[PDB]
Amino acid sequence: SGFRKMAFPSGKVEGCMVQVTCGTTTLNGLWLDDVVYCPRHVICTSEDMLNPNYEDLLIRKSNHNFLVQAGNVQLRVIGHSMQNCVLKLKVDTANPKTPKYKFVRIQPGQTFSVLACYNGSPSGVYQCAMRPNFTIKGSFLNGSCGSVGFNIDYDCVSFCYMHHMELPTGVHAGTDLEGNFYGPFVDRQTAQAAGTDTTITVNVLAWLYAAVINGDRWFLNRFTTTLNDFNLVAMKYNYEPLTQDHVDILGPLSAQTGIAVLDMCASLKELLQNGMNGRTILGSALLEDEFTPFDVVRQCS
């Protein structure tokens, strides 16, 4: 009992973090078997990032221009190539701590754990959710680019995020492990806008179910709603519309509590129209939308 924002154990990912230096900039790289993945703007100077031609900039670089360090251990670069926005450096040594892994591109509304690193050294771990506008609310200082996001499936690290850039108001953007940015962003230091963000409705409901499981039930009412009636309220407050697929995903939570999903949507309907009146739910005075239904069942197991 008790509900906390909880990240996956970072052990398997810690052994894959290395330090990549090219000229001025030092950042983090991901060392899978004999390839080191890192953001491609490691080759840029501060002037380059205003309007970089990564093709011509990378041609200026050769293998010996890339300094790769796993702790105090120098890796020798025997090849370099660019995949979208990620630099792939071939090294002479296969990473012996390489876990079973996949490269996944997560969907908006899903969560993952971030291993924040600096100069190739892991610093901390925390949970983040891919916002509907394809940004994340993380914690990244100068030197944390190349830090990765991941999920764990019984021994299989599903890498899904690599950090590249910072947006106003603690907003962060990055790519998958194939170099494709999440959202409309480009790795260039020029004016870019993130889309209008929306609240992940199915995540709020799962978080409301987590509160009921932990004995926090003051928000439950006697009313009920339909899917069209609730979605009418939902888009008024910039919530994502709820689908029957979302209702099926909340099945295990609805079954454990005995509360129908349409019943819970009626309580969320009142919470949006009347506010929380200074009350708290699971220790929060706001409606939380960064817990997936899977995140709830994993803690309420």
Ligand X SMILES: *[C@](O)(C(N)=O)[C@H](CC1CCC1)NC(=O)[C@@H]1[C@@H]2[C@H](CN1C(=O)[C@@H](NC(=O)NC(C)(C)C)C(C)(C)C)C2(C)C
Question: In whole angstroms, how close is the CB of 120 to ligand X at the nearest point?
Answer: 12
The C-alpha atoms of residue 134 and residue 172 are separated, in whole angstroms, by: 9
The pattern of x and - marking residues 18 through 57 that bind ligand X according to CB under 6 A reads -------x-x-----------x-x-------x--------
> Is 80 noted as a catalytic residue in this protein?
no
Q: Are 210 and 4 in contact (CB under 8 A)?
A: no
Q: Are the C-beta atoms of residues 18 and 31 closer than 8 Å to each other? A: yes
CA distances to 32, 139, 198, 225, 231 from 237, in Å: 43, 27, 9, 16, 10
Q: How far is the CB of 176 from ligand X (least distance, A)?
A: 16
Residue 200: which of 279, 268, 104 has the closest Cα? 268
Is 300 part of the annotated catalytic residue set?
no
Spatial separation of the C-alpha atoms in residues 160 and 103, rounded to whole Å: 6
Calpha distance 120→16 (Å, rounded):
9
The least CB distance from residue 161 to ligand X, in Å, is 14
The interface region with ligand X, picked from 102-110, 136-144, 234-242, 246-254 by CB under 6 A, is 136-144
* Residue 197 interacting with ligand X (CB under 6 A): no
Instruction: Indicate which residue of 16, 22, 38, 41 is catalytic.
Output: 41
SS3 at position 16: coil
- Half-sphere exposure for 294 (CA within 13 Å, toward CB): 10
Active-site residue (options: 145, 160, 265, 300): 145
Pick 15 or 108: Cβ nearer its own copies: 15
Residue 187 binds ligand X, judged by CB under 6 A: yes
- Which positions are catalytic? 41, 145
Q: Which residues bind ligand X (CB under 6 A)?
A: 25, 27, 39, 41, 49, 142-145, 164-167, 187-189, 191-192
